[PDB]
């Protein structure tokens, strides 16, 4: 006899839309986020097996899509800087790092030509004499971020809608894919700070026992290797160049904010990293890679890519976008303080979204941020050498795909749908 | 969820309370759209199961007796194997291919033939 049961403890892999939860101005706000659960107690699904996969994990895809949406909505109503896409008269004020550029705003407000000046970094200036254009003057629209809106990396918890559950893998040394034995059920994920960086991962979680290196396939050198450290390294970075802000009336009712003056002298931006912590960390990484690659030598080299965002380390300290030179760090051979110079940019091609760009107003200088180095994104690139070269593998910093940063924190989670109905044979009527 | 790794027989002993009814509401711009759609879908899912149980004459019951004899071509396993060996996950997968058939049989036998 077929018996119908309801409340049966089964599930199927399924996709749904997850929502933001945060502790409770900033963009991560309660119009999009709700308060967290103060006691999201895990339930151990004693003696179940679940196959997890950090790659092709739709939780990563949602995090990516919503972060993009939040950024677009936040910038949507802000000031267009298109009235400023005119030829600049530029001289100077490390050498000519910052230039004093003069220009004619020929529309502005009231249709008078307004002579005006601003201080710009050379990295945002294109030669066309001493005549210059903005780096992304044409082909895209640059909008100024609104001064009232912050983008702070508040840890965000993703939570399941009713009818859904998130399974979490608590196994040690999970390699990113395959069966997980110690599977628990949770209501929400741990909080993940939506930190954006390239080459080196910042403010993530740490591995429990040792450095764990994960890859979809190690032979396939086209894939990014994600390295999660079990110990963080603290680095502090700064932009010491004290300045004043200049408010320029460009839009009929709005305003553009630029750098008006520099207070005191000019010094290159920089990051302070420990000599010892850094090479001890590499020793640990290299050890694991030596195991993975069967004793061939591990070498660390510089990025050879073509993207300024990748060849330089990239992060955002307060409102200042940093491009730091890490060629000094990835320079070693493992068989048997450090000051990293940095640059600052005002125009950011965020997300690699064609047609869009954003402008970063100055924050008066004298800013220093301390941050946690929690992992690396890097790739292996040698090959066709068994009878040609020595047995050395070379790894270089890699990145630019923002989904990799998010994948590194979601590797242990899977979303399933609960299916309470089922049937089975009995002897009743 | 709960002891999903237990045999079906064991699992069923707490079926009564596993069915916690963790539905929205009783528990409690594109964002607005997504949030609203999710609430609507939660309602639709809830009702879908209640409607189906109503069709089979199972509404109000945790465990519902049918009018359909078990068809053994769906599985060669004895009750002992089914209930005190296999888990619910394993079981539903074994007979996942007959779900539509089973449901159709339940609908007819409890309504059209009585």
């Amino acid at each position: 006899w077929v018996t119908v049961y309801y409340g049966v403890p089964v599930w199927k892999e399924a996709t749904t839309t997850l929502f933001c939860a945060s502790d409770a101005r900033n963009v991560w706000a309660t119009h999009c986020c709700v308060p967290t659960d103060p006691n999201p107690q895990e339930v151990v699904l004693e003696n179940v097996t679940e196959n997890f996969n950090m790659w092709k994990n739709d939780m990563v895809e949602q995090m990516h899509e919503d972060i993009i949406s939040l950024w677009d909505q936040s910038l949507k109503p802000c000031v267009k800087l298109t009235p400023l896409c005119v030829t600049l008269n530029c001289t100077d004020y490390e050498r000519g790092e910052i230039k004093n550029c003069s220009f004619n705003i020929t529309t502005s407000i009231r249709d008078k030509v307004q002579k005006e000046y601003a201080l710009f970094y050379k990295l945002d200036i294109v030669p066309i004499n001493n005549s210059y254009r903005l780096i992304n003057c044409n082909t895209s629209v640059i909008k100024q971020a609104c001064p009232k809106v912050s983008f702070e990396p508040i840890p965000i918890h993703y939570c399941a809608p009713a009818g859904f559950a998130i399974l979490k893998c608590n196994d040690k040394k999970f390699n990113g894919t395959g069966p997980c034995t110690n599977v628990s059920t949770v209501q929400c994920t741990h909080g993940i700070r939506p930190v954006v960086s390239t080459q080196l991962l910042l403010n993530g979680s740490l591995a429990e026992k040792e450095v764990v290196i994960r890859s979809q396939n190690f032979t396939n050198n086209a894939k990014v290797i994600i390295v999660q450290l079990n110990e963080s390294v603290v680095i502090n970075c700064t932009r010491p160049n004290n300045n004043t802000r200049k408010s320029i009336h460009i839009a009929p009712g709005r305003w553009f904010y630029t750098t008006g003056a520099i207070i005191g002298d000019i010094r290159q931006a920089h990051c302070n990293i420990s000599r010892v912590k850094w090479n001890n960390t590499l020793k640990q990484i290299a050890t694991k890679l030596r195991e993975q690659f069967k004793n061939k030598t591990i070498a660390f080299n510089q990025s050879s890519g073509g993207d300024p965002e990748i060849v330089m380390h990239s992060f955002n300290c307060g409102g200042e976008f940093f491009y730091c030179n890490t060629t000094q760090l990835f320079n070693s051979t493992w068989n048997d303080h450090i000051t990293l110079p940095c640059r600052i940019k005002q125009i950011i091609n965020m997300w690699q979204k064609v047609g869009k760009a954003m402008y970063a107003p100055p924050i008066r200088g004298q800013i220093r941020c301390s941050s946690n180095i929690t992992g690396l994104l890097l790739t292996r690139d040698g090959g066709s050498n068994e009878n040609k070269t020595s047995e050395t593998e070379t790894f270089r910093p890699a990145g630019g795909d923002m989904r990799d940063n998010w994948r590194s924190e979601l590797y242990k989670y899977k979303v399933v749908k609960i299916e309470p109905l089922g049937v089975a044979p009995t002897k009743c009527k | 969820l709960g002891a999903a790794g237990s045999t079906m027989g064991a699992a069923s002993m707490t079926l009564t309370v596993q069915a916690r009814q963790l539905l929205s509401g009783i528990v409690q711009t594109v964002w607005g759209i997504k949030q609203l759609q999710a609430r609507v879908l939660a309602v639709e899912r809830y009702l879908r199961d209640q409607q189906l149980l109503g069709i089979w004459g199972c509404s109000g019951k945790l465990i519902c007796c049918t009018a359909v004899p078990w068809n053994n071509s769906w599985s060669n396993r004895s009750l002992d194997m089914i209930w005190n060996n296999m888990t619910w996950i394993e079981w539903e997968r074994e007979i996942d291919n007959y779900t539509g058939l089973i449901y159709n049989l339940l609908e007819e036998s409890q309504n059209q033939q009585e």
Partner: antibody
Framework: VQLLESGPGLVKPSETLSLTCTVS????????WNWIRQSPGKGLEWIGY???????NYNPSLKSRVTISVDMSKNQFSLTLRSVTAADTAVYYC??????????????????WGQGTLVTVSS | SYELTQPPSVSVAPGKTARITCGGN??????VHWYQQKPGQAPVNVIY???DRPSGIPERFSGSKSGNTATLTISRVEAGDEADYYC???????????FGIGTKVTVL
């Protein structure tokens, strides 16, 4: 598969009885756990059942004094009776509970019955 | 709770069928299990439903239930089957196991 009983084998009057039984194969979260005793010359007396979770029940004659613990790490269980009498001399059996999910909780006879351990109460 | 009543004993000649009965209120509406206990040994299930025998138990064992009576049937009873046979039901109103008295089966 096998269940093996153990215990002091002899307790004093007014001593609390504690019997630990080991499960040799299948992890203890897979099925229900149950204890039964048989006084010499008598048929069986059910004591109670427990499970991985808090689902449990006991025979009213013992209920006020009986609990059975669960040790998931070691796949062990232990029956504790806070009694005082020699009337509790019995062979105690470690059994696992099987069932079919029907109306009225049609619990199956406990196939993996165990071996049985005799507990004597004597001064 | 629930009543399960068995005769103290039955007796058969070797090779003959034993009819071991158990009564109770609407006993035939409950699943009724039976088991065999050899003196000094742990018991074993010999039947768990009407006509449903476990593996490991021979074809001698059968049984059925109807009305308010359950019967354990052992055909071709062997001397090796001298044993105490018992009935079991689960009482859902108390959610407890109920055991019968036990019937001694004598084999002549």
């Amino acid at each position: 598969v096998q269940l093996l009983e153990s215990g002091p084998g002899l307790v004093k009057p007014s001593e609390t009885l504690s019997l630990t039984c080991t499960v040799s194969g299948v992890p203890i979260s897979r099925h229900y756990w149950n204890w039964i005793r048989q006084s010499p010359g008598k048929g069986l007396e059910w004591i109670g059942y427990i499970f991985f979770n808090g689902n449990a029940n006991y025979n009213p004659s013992l209920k006020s004094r009986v609990t059975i613990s669960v040790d998931m790490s070691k796949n062990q269980f232990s029956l504790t009776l806070r009694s005082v009498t020699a009337a509790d001399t019995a062979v105690y059996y470690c059994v696992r509970e099987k069932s079919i999910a029907e109306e009225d909780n049609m619990v199956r006879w406990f196939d993996p019955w165990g071996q049985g351990t005799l507990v004597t109460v004597s001064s | 709770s629930y009543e399960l009543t068995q005769p103290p004993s039955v007796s058969v000649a070797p090779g003959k069928t034993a009819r071991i009965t158990c009564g109770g209120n609407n006993l035939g509406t409950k699943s009724v299990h039976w088991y065999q206990q050899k003196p000094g040994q742990a018991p074993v299930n010999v039947i768990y439903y009407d006509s449903d025998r476990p593996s490991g138990i021979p074809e001698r064992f059968s049984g059925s239930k109807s009305g308010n009576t359950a019967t354990l049937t052992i055909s071709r009873v062997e001397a090796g089957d001298e044993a105490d046979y018992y009935c079991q039901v689960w009482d859902s109103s108390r959610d407890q196991c109920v055991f019968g008295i036990g019937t001694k089966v004598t084999v002549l």
